[PDB]
């Protein structure tokens, strides 16, 4: 599959939990 | 533009974060947020989340 860019900070929120 | 667009997952994507939208190839996704950088946010069926913008294709 295509390369998944790391989540940019500008797309994150406190809900960006891993 | 991609915002508000309906796209189809070209590849399966398994969320790596709780705010990500897992989907399978063929899944129809409604793009609800576009940000440069490789990720869009959208919904598929009853789920919402960010997903790799290069994992979908315009329908």
Swiss-Prot record, chain B:
Processing after translation: Phosphorylated by PTK2/FAK1; this promotes interaction with RAC1.
Role description: Acts as a RAC1 guanine nucleotide exchange factor (GEF) and can induce membrane ruffling. Functions in cell migration, attachment and cell spreading. Promotes targeting of RAC1 to focal adhesions. May function as a positive regulator of apoptosis. Downstream of NMDA receptors and CaMKK-CaMK1 signaling cascade, promotes the formation of spines and synapses in hippocampal neurons.
Lineage summary: Eukaryota, Metazoa, Chordata, Craniata, Vertebrata
Protein name: Rho guanine nucleotide exchange factor 7
Domain SH3: 6-59
Domain of life: Eukaryota
Biological source species: Rattus norvegicus (Rat)
Compartments, as annotated in UniProt: Cell junction, Focal adhesion; Cell projection, Ruffle; Cytoplasm, Cell cortex; Cell projection, Lamellipodium
Assembly with partners or alone: Interacts with SCRIB; interaction is direct and may play a role in regulation of apoptosis. Interacts with PAK kinases through the SH3 domain. Interacts with GIT1 and probably TGFB1I1. Interacts with ITCH and PARVB. Interacts with FRMPD4 (via N-terminus). Interacts with CaMK1. Interacts with PTK2/FAK1 and RAC1. Interacts with BIN2. Interacts with YWHAZ. Interacts (via PH domain) with NOX1 (via FAD-binding FR-type domain).
Shown residues within the full chain: 10 to 63 of 646
Disulphide linkage map: none
